[PDB]
């Protein structure tokens, strides 16, 4: 049990841990399609180009707060075939110590092959994902005393509901931090999740989804939370405090829509940053949003790069000198 | 150039390298297909079983001669993801030296999906396999003199013939095997392969093919070729020589048809490990016998165990005590 030596700003990242394996078929799926026998196919495809992205949400956001600088611990289950993303992760001060590797199953993977006009097949393998249940906080606080902050991010839906309920117990600060869960979880689950976080994360059509499924009104959620944040794509994001002061930020502008998939997570660990490195509400919306840029104009979701004074620069523009100034401060 | 401290007895094997991603659908495809648009298709299957196995011809037929004691070098191209494949390799005594490993593509691989009804849906990724055609032989010689025999598997077709053509410039004893790429390549390309070749393998439905597209007879083949070796499934093996002599030598029974992916690459591995061992023709042709029974009782390619006194007291079992001692005689 570590008294004396604890932990002081670190961010304990619950959630998936998978890979994306993505291939481009050069035809058409529906050449081998239309003359087949649909109640036995037997399709076989030649692809011609396949990228592997490293990913799951907790993968993508402790990337992330790692990159930034801050203290974070990668807590959730993989294979024996995560062992080169761990050195990936650790490259960039993530701390992989409280990742379960499965004995049995491999690292979850979603492996998806595009054809010529967009058509997609598609599998998604959870593998080692489902043994995110068996881990335990408690070890985690044994280890490095109490984190600052416990995101609950999208998981095997059990894992999400008993580290909730482990929050609860050991009394840690958590985001609940459901995101694409919201459209699989029941009422019943989703209510589970919500009550005494610190922060509720989703985007918009995510937050009207969570009122209609729990039957819960506005007011229902706002008097179980410190505080919601819900983003609006390109009109930016909105913190919503239970005393119903609402600060909205803009979004940092983009050079490219380039890939969407991983800006959800980047804005969620660029505010988290903010706030462990002491920024206010509407300085780390600010910096969330220069992280969720920076993914958007990539490809892939841990595939961008991180440079200080393009940082600052980007900042300025966006929400003028003296707010840059403010969030590079505690940057480097 | 190494003149000084060259290989004795080298096999140096020339095929593809790759990996199979096999993937289990408890359902049925045709439950999403039947409703679909097929013009256009959205498929995504929860699978629930992952197994990943190391193979590729060359990759196949190197590990096996490895396990065995014998000398032997892999040449082909792999991506940098094959680095944990080359460590596997190089602990069963494989000299990888010789893979050039693309600075772009990845590993080449083979992706199936199999649902309750035995419907398949695959992918093909070539990947590095493209870049074997760049692989100089030459460069082989001049590090480890020349080999003992250099074997022409299945792999990128530009690579077979270059790898032919230049065995012949160099005066290396090849063997033609070119198993599958006989239901691909035309009758052209097929003679291109055949010239000078110390072995030439193949199944029996093969040698059909190979005979018809190229239109060559038997004996226009025979002329051109030191031995054919043309596996027989149940029926075993027969190794005819240009003279007309025939040597037929039956299989190892089996207690299991496990898997028969790899028994082709692993009966090549163990007769030309019994030649390199100074075996004459049948003996080597029962080594390969035996080998090829382990890999039939395993699934998978390289997932096969070794064990000596099993191989000894099957050996006997098959082909009585005294072939059985000359054979054990050489292994280890």
Redesign the interface.
């Known amino acids: 049990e570590d008294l004396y030596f604890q932990s002081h700003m670190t961010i304990a990242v619950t959630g998936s841990i998978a890979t994306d394996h993505l291939?481009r078929?050069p035809g058409?799926?529906?050449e081998q399609?239309?003359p087949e026998h649909?109640?036995?196919?037997?399709?076989?495809?030649?692809?011609?180009?396949?990228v592997?992205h490293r990913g799951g949400v907790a993968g993508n956001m402790a990337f992330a707060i790692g990159v930034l600088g801050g203290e974070v611990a990668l807590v959730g289950a993989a294979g024996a075939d995560f062992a080169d993303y761990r050195d990936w992760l650790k490259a960039r001060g993530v701390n992989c110590d409280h990742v379960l590797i499965s004995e049995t199953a491999?690292t979850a993977?979603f492996?998806c092959?595009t054809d010529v006009?967009?058509?997609?097949?598609?599998?998604?393998?959870?593998?080692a994902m489902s043994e995110a249940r068996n881990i335990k906080l408690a070890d985690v606080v044994s280890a490095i005393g109490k984190p600052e902050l416990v995101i609950i991010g999208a998981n095997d839906p059990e894992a999400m509901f008993l580290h909730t309920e482990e929050c609860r117990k050991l009394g840690l600060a958590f985001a609940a931090d459901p995101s694409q869960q919201l459209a699989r979880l029941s009422g019943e689950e989703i209510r589970r999740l919500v009550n005494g976080a610190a922060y509720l994360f989703t985007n918009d059509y995510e937050w009207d989804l969570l009122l209609s499924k729990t039957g819960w009104s506005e007011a229902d959620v706002m008097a179980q939370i410190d505080l919601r944040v819900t983003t609006l794509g390109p009109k930016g994001v909105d913190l919503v405090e239970p005393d119903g002061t609402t600060i909205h930020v803009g979004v940092v502008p983009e050079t490219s829509q380039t890939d969407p998939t991983g800006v959800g997570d980047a804005f969620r660990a660029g505010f988290l940053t903010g706030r462990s490195a002491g920024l206010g509400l509407e300085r780390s919306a600010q910096l969330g949003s220069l992280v969720a840029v920076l993914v958007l104009e990539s490809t892939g979701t841990q595939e961008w790069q991180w440079d200080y004074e393009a940082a600052a620069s980007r900042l300025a523009g966006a929400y003028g000198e003296h707010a840059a100034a403010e969030i590079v401060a505690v940057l480097a």
């Open positions: 291939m078929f058409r799926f529906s399609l239309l649909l109640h036995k196919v037997s399709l076989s495809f030649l692809v011609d180009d396949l592997m491999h993977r492996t092959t006009d967009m058509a997609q097949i598609a599998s998604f393998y959870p593998g």
